[PDB]
RNA sequence: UAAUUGCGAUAACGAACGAGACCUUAACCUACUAAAUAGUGGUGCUAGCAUUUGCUGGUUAUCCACUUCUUAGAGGGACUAUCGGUUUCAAGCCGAUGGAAGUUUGAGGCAAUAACAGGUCUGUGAUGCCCUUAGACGUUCUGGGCCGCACGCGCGCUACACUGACGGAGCCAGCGAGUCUAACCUUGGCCGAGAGGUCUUGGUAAUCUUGUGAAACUCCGUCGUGCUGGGGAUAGAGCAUUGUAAUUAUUGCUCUUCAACGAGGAAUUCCUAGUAAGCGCAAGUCAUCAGCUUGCGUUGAUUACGUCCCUGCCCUUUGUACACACC
């Protein structure tokens, strides 16, 4: 009676709408996406080629909803990781920017997101409808 | 707190000493709202060695 | 040298055999038969189907099922 | 003008340390002698109120071989 | 459940591009036995041969490998792109390469022929038989050869 | 196997001329009786108990 | 048990096995019994605890170290070597996972099976390195209580540790691969197999 | 370890001599006693003090003192 | 209106969780989210401990609003498990009375794993010379 | 006793320096004074799931109230308190109770007398003397060198993997820094696999960067003991960034080459609680370049609560043919 997304377990919540937007066929999967790194931080592609686009979509809706407004900078920050540089200490590395802003350009063109002011990406009424939906779904998953 | 960090030896011998200086800057703002003889007198009514002041007009 | 491929032979192993243990796992599996480790995963995936071995712990490390019901 | 130097005159230049260093260059320099030089900012400081004093001069004393010699007199701390 | 048996169409070892091939083994990783495939390019040949990943090598059909064999000899008209490649912009020819078997070996020892023959630093160094990037020799790499 | 439970009375002090064997008291637990000091390689504090091998021996200082 | 409700559910296996009895993870600290006196009150089986971490603060004085939970004892003596320190997380997980195999590999208490595993390891008697002379002799003493729960579970990790090193099988199999070899001595375990060898050697050189 | 210094306990006996009914056997009241009758230059001191002046108390009214 | 409140909060390292605390119809929550969520995971039961401790009914009567701040995923848990237990007691102490309140009270600190008095543990300094605030640099002689 | 710290013994009595006090920093404060450059509750305006009121957000001031959380002024606070065991029943030590805190509360700053031919004239427009001063040892300009590699040695870094690697996904710090007659920190938008590019923006800063969404770590999945997808040396080819200038590879990126290394002989360093260890981060340096350092916080233990066996020191006893003092 009453659900948020914030009442969903992250892992949950996430692979969920990763299927349904999968599935729903309408988002924009880049050209690539198939030979792309995510970041310069990793080693390897990620290994659902298939729908692993999918996941991060679902991932960067459900973050941007929680804040205010979020840009492509702190995407990249926040999918950032570590990278092996060998035979030296590992730093902190940010993620490829076109993946996260495609996404975020991508994520207009079904209304999910939108532009802000101050800048970055804020949630629309129109996804923030779509989530709360799909959350109380994956939530009612009890028969 | 301002730090500025070295060795207190000059060259380079002796066990691998160092010093820390500190600088304390400390910071404090008033707002009053007064009129022509009370704005210039109290500018300059408080005034002391050592003490930065600077007082702002107002909007922008 | 293991085994990454299903011999039928080997199948047969399996489910005339695994309800025998009433603790089975990855390794469980790799030691008694000639398992992959990759295979053994999903050997267990699929002993789950009509719960030839039932769970109480499923987690990415670790696996932990007990014998039949 | 928007900078104006002033002029104080001291209080009693026999407290300040560098107004009594400047007296021991100055004594020396104008041919004194070592020890007396010495005492006698002591004497000064000591007569104007204080609690203590200590001058150490080093470097070359009777020449040669460098050597370094204390004149205190009073009281003195260290520590805190 | 990718519990399925096959009878006798499994053949472990097969042979490509001059080399043997193990079949037991990932085919991401199976084929990353010839000298020019790597992890990534071998990642990226297969998802451009419409290769089911979930597999081994000793699977893997005759015709699944000439669409593999295909594309990694000709991997830029496949959608694989040029920064992809291990020779992009010879230095005689200009074109994009990606070169592999033992023919990676003989495009090393052109390279250094090349640069030995110019009789540049560079080039002095790997004859000599010394470390041609700008490291200390003073302390490491000792024992050689 | 003849073994002995033995309670702690007093921790005489450290011999070993490393410092890491304490001497102490036991009060022999089943028959209270009894009244031996033993020797200790870790930390002894009076009142837990011992479990003695050879229930005799008894020594004393040690280096 | 009451089922009690609220705004946020909370669910049933939470405030059921909860206000009730405090299980472990959920396992019944109950009737648990120190098998072998004289280590007891120091394998602290009394005080209940749902999970193996807590603000330990055990360090301080001497014997505190014992009003701390035997099962965290063990759980903090797994996390070691270099690339394991720390990571306390990561243990907790291993021993939850190790109960399990346990119990399942003999019905009963893992709780229980663990403890049991402690003491018939811990040392009677060992051998200190005497003075001697030159070729320094080796004396023969008995060991404290609170080395003998001390020494116990170091063989113990120890002995998963090594063993689970390069081998397929985890660390939570090997842990009951080590403490179901100990809690029956059967000697096919690395701390039993290293306790029976200190007391051989303390029956000997005395 | 805690041994008091001189200067703490030359205070305690020169305090207790010249104040034996003003004091008392409770720190703080003795700890405030201090900052009427004496000047200390800093807390951690005055309490220091005042904390062995009320030992002190507490052993006197048990049998004489040696000092 | 303005609903009686109270507010109480937890400290653990740098982790500094503030609680709020007003009558209501039993809601838990931790930065705006469920408590039955908070999953830094093998620790869920360290948040869980001061609800089943003294009863799980004492709270039907009140709305627990917790949000973090500060330290890491594992001091957090300690700093908000130690804010809604030093909440419970403290509506108790402002809103009803005393004997019920140490009830509560003596409930925890039986139990006390930190729950209502803030563990003041803090990081050491380092020192030059290692890099650690006890660990030295290696030395070599001659 | 950490202490020439103290009780005491006392031909000594009474004191000063050093130790202690002191200062800093870190812990407690619902007690005081405050806060649009810090937060919170309510109230408008507005969004979504539910609709049974509710749960969750947005709004730089809609308007009001406050100071718990933050900041920093003023104070409070501990004194080893209280009881108990020891002890010349003295200094004190130990234990248990409470307490934010009971190891000098933790950690530092400071630190006497006397001394060493210890290092530094290459920090100084500090300096004696010698040297040289226009074929200059001064100065500036062009290029090279300090990094040259059969090898000895020290500090490190990355590793040998399954308590792991890889891929997804969860997502949490504290210490800090930043552009005026200037081009520093840089959000955001676009472009680019990446590195990086481009158009704008905020900030001289509790206000903008920045909640510095850090890594360890957590979940799920792939890999399955094989020098393996552990390890990433060496090397080829290409794209970019700093700079006048990158060759003897400045750095960064991408593909490819895939070494030694299967726990390290004799030896040997460092450590007792938020410590060790692991983890990264800011700051110094800096046009560019950290495998270095100065600090910071995140995860967080095993073992001691001791002794003089080894190794140093310190006092006392003792020997001396040493006093330029066992070189
Ligand atoms: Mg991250
Ligand atoms: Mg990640
Ligand atoms: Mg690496
Ligand atoms: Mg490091
Ligand atoms: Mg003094
Ligand atoms: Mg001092
Ligand atoms: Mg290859
Ligand atoms: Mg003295
Ligand atoms: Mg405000
Ligand atoms: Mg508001
Ligand atoms: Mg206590
Ligand atoms: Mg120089
Ligand atoms: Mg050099
Ligand atoms: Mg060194
Ligand atoms: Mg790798
Ligand atoms: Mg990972
Ligand atoms: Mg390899
Ligand atoms: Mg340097
Ligand atoms: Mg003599
Ligand atoms: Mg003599």
Redesign the pocket.
């Given at each position: 009676?009453?659900?948020?997304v914030?009442?969903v377990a992250?892992?949950d919540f996430?692979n969920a709408y990763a299927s349904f937007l999968q599935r729903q066929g309408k988002l924009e999967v880049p050209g690539?996406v198939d030979?792309?790194?995510?970041?310069?931080?990793?080693?390897?592609?990620?290994?659902?080629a298939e729908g692993?686009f999918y996941?991060?979509a679902?991932?960067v809706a459900?973050?941007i909803?929680?804040?205010?407004?979020?840009?492509?900078?702190?995407?990249?920050?926040?999918?950032?990781?570590?990278?092996?540089?060998?035979?030296?200490?590992?730093?902190?590395?940010?993620?490829?920017?076109?993946?996260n802003?495609?996404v975020?350009?991508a994520l207009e063109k079904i209304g999910i997101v939108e532009?802000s002011p101050?800048?970055?990406?804020?949630?629309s009424?129109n996804g923030?409808?779509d989530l709360?939906?799909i959350?109380?779904q994956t939530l009612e998953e009890d028969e | 707190?301002?730090?500025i960090?070295?060795r207190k030896?000059?060259?380079?011998?002796?066990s691998?000493t160092?010093?820390?200086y500190?600088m304390?800057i400390?910071?404090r703002?008033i707002?009053l709202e007064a009129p022509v003889q009370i704005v210039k007198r109290i500018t300059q009514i408080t005034i002391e060695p050592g003490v930065d002041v600077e007082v702002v007009v107002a909007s922008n | 040298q293991?085994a990454?491929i299903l011999d039928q032979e080997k199948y047969d192993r399996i489910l005339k055999e695994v309800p025998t243990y009433r603790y089975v796992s990855?390794?469980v599996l790799?030691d008694r038969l000639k398992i992959?480790?990759?295979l053994?995963?999903?050997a267990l995936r699929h002993l789950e189907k009509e719960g030839i071995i039932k769970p109480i712990s499923?987690?990415?490390?670790q696996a932990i099922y007990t014998r039949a019901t | 003008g928007t900078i104006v130097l002033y002029a104080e005159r001291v209080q009693d230049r026999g407290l300040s340390a560098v107004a009594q260093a400047e007296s021991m260059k100055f004594k020396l320099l104008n041919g004194l002698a070592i020890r007396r030089a010495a005492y006698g900012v002591v004497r000064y400081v000591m007569e104007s109120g204080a609690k203590g004093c200590?001058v150490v001069v080093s470097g070359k004393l009777r020449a040669?071989?460098?050597k370094?010699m204390?004149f205190a007199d009073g009281?003195?701390?260290?520590?805190? | 459940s990718l519990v399925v048996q096959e009878q006798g169409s499994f053949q472990h070892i097969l042979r490509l591009l001059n080399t043997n091939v193990d079949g037991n083994?990932?085919i991401?990783?199976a084929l990353?036995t010839?000298?020019?495939?790597?992890?990534?390019?071998?990642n990226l040949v297969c998802k451009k041969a419409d290769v089911d990943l979930?597999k081994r090598a000793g699977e893997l059909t005759q015709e699944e490998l000439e669409r593999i064999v295909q594309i990694m000899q000709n991997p830029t008209h496949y959608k694989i792109?040029?920064?992809?490649?291990?020779?992009?912009?010879?230095?005689t020819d200009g074109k994009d390469y990606?070169?592999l078997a033992n023919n990676?070996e003989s495009?090393?020892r052109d390279?250094?022929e090349?640069?030995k023959k110019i009789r540049?630093?560079?080039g002095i160094?790997?004859f000599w038989?010394?470390?041609?990037?700008?490291?200390?020799?003073?302390?490491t790499?000792?024992?050689?050869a | 196997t003849p073994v002995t439970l033995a309670k702690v009375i007093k921790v005489l002090?450290?011999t070993?001329?490393?410092?890491?064997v304490?001497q102490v008291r036991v009060e022999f637990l089943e028959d209270t009786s009894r009244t031996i000091v033993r020797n200790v390689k870790?930390?002894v504090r009076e009142n837990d108990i011992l479990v003695l091998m050879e229930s005799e021996r008894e020594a004393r200082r040690l280096? | 048990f009451t089922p009690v409700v609220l705004?946020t559910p909370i669910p049933e296996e939470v405030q059921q096995a909860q206000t009730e009895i405090k299980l472990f993870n959920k396992w019944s600290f109950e009737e648990v019994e120190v098998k072998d006196a004289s280590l007891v009150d120091y394998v602290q089986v009394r005080q209940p605890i749902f999970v193996a971490?807590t603000?330990?603060?055990?360090?301080?004085?001497?014997?505190?170290?014992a009003q701390?939970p035997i099962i965290?004892?063990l759980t903090?003596?797994?996390?070691?070597?270099?690339?394991?320190?720390?990571?306390?997380?990561?243990?907790v997980?291993?021993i939850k996972h190790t109960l399990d195999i346990i119990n399942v590999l003999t019905d009963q208490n893992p709780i229980q099976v663990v403890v049991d595993a402690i003491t018939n390891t811990g040392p009677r008697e060992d051998t200190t390195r005497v003075?001697g002379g030159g070729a320094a002799r080796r004396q023969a003493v008995d060991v404290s209580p609170?080395?003998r729960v001390?020494?116990a579970?170091?063989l113990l990790?120890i002995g998963?540790?090594e063993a689970?090193?390069?081998?397929?099988?985890?660390?939570?199999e090997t842990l009951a691969e080590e403490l179901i070899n100990a809690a029956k001595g059967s000697s096919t375990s690395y701390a039993i197999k290293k306790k029976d060898e200190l007391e051989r050697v303390a029956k000997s050189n005395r | 370890?805690?041994?008091?210094?001189?200067?703490?306990?030359?205070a305690s006996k020169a305090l207790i001599e010249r104040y034996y009914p003003k004091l008392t056997?409770?720190?703080?009241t003795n700890?405030r006693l201090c900052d009427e009758i004496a000047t200390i230059?800093?807390?951690?001191?005055?309490?220091?003090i005042?904390?062995?002046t009320?030992?002190?108390m507490?052993?006197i009214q048990k049998?004489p003192?040696?000092? | 209106?303005?609903?009686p409140?109270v507010?109480?909060?937890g400290?653990?390292?740098?982790?500094?969780a503030?609680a709020?605390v007003k009558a209501?119809?039993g809601?838990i929550?931790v930065?705006?989210?469920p408590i039955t969520l908070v999953?830094?995971?093998?620790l869920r039961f360290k948040v869980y401990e001061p609800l089943l401790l003294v009863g799980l009914d004492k709270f039907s009567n009140i709305?627990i609003?917790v949000?973090?701040?500060?330290?890491?995923?594992?001091?957090?848990v300690?700093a908000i498990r130690q804010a809604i237990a030093?909440g419970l007691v403290?509506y108790h102490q402002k809103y009803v009375d005393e004997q019920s309140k140490n009830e509560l009270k003596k409930a925890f600190?039986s139990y006390d794993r930190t729950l209502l008095?803030?563990?003041?543990?803090?990081?050491?300094?380092?020192?030059?010379?290692?890099?650690?605030?006890?660990?030295?640099?290696?030395?070599?002689?001659r």
């Open positions: 009676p009453g659900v948020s914030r009442d992250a892992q996430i690539y030979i792309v790194k995510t970041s310069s931080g990793n080693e390897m592609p990620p290994q659902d692993w996941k991060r679902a991932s459900r973050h909803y929680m804040r205010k407004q979020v840009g492509v900078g702190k995407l990249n920050k926040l999918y950032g990781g570590a990278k092996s540089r060998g035979v030296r200490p590992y730093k902190h590395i940010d993620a490829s920017g076109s993946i802003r495609k975020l350009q532009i101050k800048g970055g990406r804020r949630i009424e923030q409808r709360d939906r959350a109380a | 707190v301002l730090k960090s070295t030896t000059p060259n380079g011998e002796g691998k160092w010093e820390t500190e304390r400390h910071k703002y707002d | 293991h990454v990855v390794s790799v992959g480790g990759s053994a995963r999903i499923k987690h990415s490390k | 200590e040669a071989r460098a370094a204390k009281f003195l701390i260290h520590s805190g | 083994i990932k991401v990783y990353t010839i000298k020019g495939v790597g992890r990534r390019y071998s979930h792109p040029a920064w992809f490649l291990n020779r992009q912009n010879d230095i990606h070169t990676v495009k090393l390279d250094l090349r640069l540049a630093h560079r160094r790997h038989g010394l470390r041609v990037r700008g490291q200390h020799t003073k302390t790499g000792r024992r050689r | 002090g450290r070993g001329s490393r410092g890491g304490t870790g930390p280096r | 705004a971490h603000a330990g603060r055990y360090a301080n004085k001497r014997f505190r170290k701390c965290e004892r903090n003596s797994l996390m070691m070597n270099g690339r394991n320190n720390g990571k306390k997380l990561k243990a997980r291993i003075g609170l080395r001390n020494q579970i170091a990790t998963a540790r689970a090193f390069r081998n397929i099988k985890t660390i939570a | 370890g805690r041994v008091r210094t001189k200067t703490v306990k030359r056997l409770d720190f703080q700890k230059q800093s807390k951690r001191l005055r309490n220091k005042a904390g062995y009320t030992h002190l507490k052993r049998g003192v040696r000092g | 209106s303005a609903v409140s507010q109480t909060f400290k653990k390292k740098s982790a500094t503030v709020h209501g119809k809601l929550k930065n705006g989210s999953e830094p995971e093998i709305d609003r949000r973090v701040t500060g330290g890491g995923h594992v001091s957090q300690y030093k403290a600190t008095i803030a563990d003041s543990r803090r990081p050491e300094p380092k020192k030059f010379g290692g890099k650690g605030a006890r660990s030295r640099f290696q030395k070599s002689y």
